[PDB]
Enzyme design. Sequence first.
Site, PDB file in Angstrom:
ATOM      1  N   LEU A 125     -24.680  56.851 -29.197  1.00  0.00           N
ATOM      2  CA  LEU A 125     -25.434  56.263 -30.301  1.00  0.00           C
ATOM      3  C   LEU A 125     -26.590  55.392 -29.805  1.00  0.00           C
ATOM      4  O   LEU A 125     -27.696  55.459 -30.347  1.00  0.00           O
ATOM      5  CB  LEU A 125     -24.497  55.448 -31.204  1.00  0.00           C
ATOM      6  CG  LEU A 125     -25.042  54.757 -32.460  1.00  0.00           C
ATOM      7  CD1 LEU A 125     -25.348  55.755 -33.567  1.00  0.00           C
ATOM      8  CD2 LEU A 125     -24.056  53.708 -32.953  1.00  0.00           C
ATOM      9  N   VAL A 126     -26.331  54.583 -28.777  1.00  0.00           N
ATOM     10  CA  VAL A 126     -27.341  53.662 -28.236  1.00  0.00           C
ATOM     11  C   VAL A 126     -28.419  54.361 -27.401  1.00  0.00           C
ATOM     12  O   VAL A 126     -29.447  53.758 -27.077  1.00  0.00           O
ATOM     13  CB  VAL A 126     -26.720  52.469 -27.444  1.00  0.00           C
ATOM     14  CG1 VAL A 126     -25.820  51.626 -28.344  1.00  0.00           C
ATOM     15  CG2 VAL A 126     -25.971  52.952 -26.208  1.00  0.00           C
TER      16      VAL A 126
ATOM     17  N   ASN B  14     -35.318  52.508 -39.174  1.00  0.00           N
ATOM     18  CA  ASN B  14     -36.040  53.050 -40.319  1.00  0.00           C
ATOM     19  C   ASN B  14     -35.537  54.446 -40.689  1.00  0.00           C
ATOM     20  O   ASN B  14     -34.778  55.061 -39.934  1.00  0.00           O
ATOM     21  CB  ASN B  14     -37.555  53.038 -40.079  1.00  0.00           C
ATOM     22  CG  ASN B  14     -37.976  53.881 -38.890  1.00  0.00           C
ATOM     23  OD1 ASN B  14     -37.714  55.082 -38.834  1.00  0.00           O
ATOM     24  ND2 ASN B  14     -38.652  53.254 -37.935  1.00  0.00           N
ATOM     25  N   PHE B  15     -35.966  54.936 -41.849  1.00  0.00           N
ATOM     26  CA  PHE B  15     -35.510  56.222 -42.378  1.00  0.00           C
ATOM     27  C   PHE B  15     -35.847  57.403 -41.473  1.00  0.00           C
ATOM     28  O   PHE B  15     -35.079  58.360 -41.391  1.00  0.00           O
ATOM     29  CB  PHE B  15     -36.074  56.446 -43.783  1.00  0.00           C
ATOM     30  CG  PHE B  15     -35.316  55.728 -44.868  1.00  0.00           C
ATOM     31  CD1 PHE B  15     -34.489  54.644 -44.572  1.00  0.00           C
ATOM     32  CD2 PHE B  15     -35.442  56.126 -46.193  1.00  0.00           C
ATOM     33  CE1 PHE B  15     -33.792  53.982 -45.575  1.00  0.00           C
ATOM     34  CE2 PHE B  15     -34.753  55.466 -47.204  1.00  0.00           C
ATOM     35  CZ  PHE B  15     -33.924  54.393 -46.893  1.00  0.00           C
TER      36      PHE B  15
ATOM     37  N   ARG C 261     -27.793  65.108 -34.173  1.00  0.00           N
ATOM     38  CA  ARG C 261     -26.362  64.940 -33.922  1.00  0.00           C
ATOM     39  C   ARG C 261     -25.458  65.685 -34.901  1.00  0.00           C
ATOM     40  O   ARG C 261     -24.392  66.159 -34.515  1.00  0.00           O
ATOM     41  CB  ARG C 261     -25.988  63.454 -33.874  1.00  0.00           C
ATOM     42  CG  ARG C 261     -26.683  62.661 -32.770  1.00  0.00           C
ATOM     43  CD  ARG C 261     -26.349  63.196 -31.383  1.00  0.00           C
ATOM     44  NE  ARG C 261     -26.732  62.252 -30.336  1.00  0.00           N
ATOM     45  CZ  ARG C 261     -26.400  62.371 -29.053  1.00  0.00           C
ATOM     46  NH1 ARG C 261     -25.674  63.402 -28.636  1.00  0.00           N
ATOM     47  NH2 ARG C 261     -26.796  61.453 -28.181  1.00  0.00           N
TER      48      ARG C 261
END
Length: 216
Positions: A81-82, A159-160, A170
């Site tokens: 994730l990071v 942000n979106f 993913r």
Amino acid sequence: EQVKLSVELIACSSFTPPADVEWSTDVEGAEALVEFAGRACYASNAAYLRHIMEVGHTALLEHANATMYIRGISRSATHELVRHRHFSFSQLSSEVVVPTLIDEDPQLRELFMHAMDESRFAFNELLNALEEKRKKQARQAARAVLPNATESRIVVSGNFRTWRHFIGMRASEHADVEIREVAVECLRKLQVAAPTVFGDFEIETLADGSQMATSP
């Protein structure tokens, strides 16, 4: 103790138009913000955001932000994730996450949870011997034996466009399993919050019971 993934939407963009600007919209919040940002360059909200996506001017989606509180995510999926560098993170400085492929087999789960105990025993034992004879350093040395399955709790903002990019990468591949489930659950919450920005994604359940999301 075994824990499951829980993703909660804790923040979204609250929008207020400028007083002197002559402009009104049907939607409230983040989607009204993306609409304002689009028109500010020069019919309804849902019709307008469909056109933004169609032409592919995704730089407008960067004004709207959303924050997730994610629990029940393993250390390894947190590391995946990071890797996405346009997110901001706050991570938690016993709970364990079991892969779906092991969890669906009671024989394999019994063996997995046994190994989780082994690591915890080895952790406790090392920590005691280190504190026998600075203690912040004894804890981080002992943490070296802890497995990838260890649950981490993480606050994630972006942000979106960053979210659209995370989900699109993913929630499509197979490969990897846990990061998919995280990405699908994030999209699901974003589809409640922003129906049009995230409506192009189609959530489908695969033969093996896990979910994926794809976009044209």
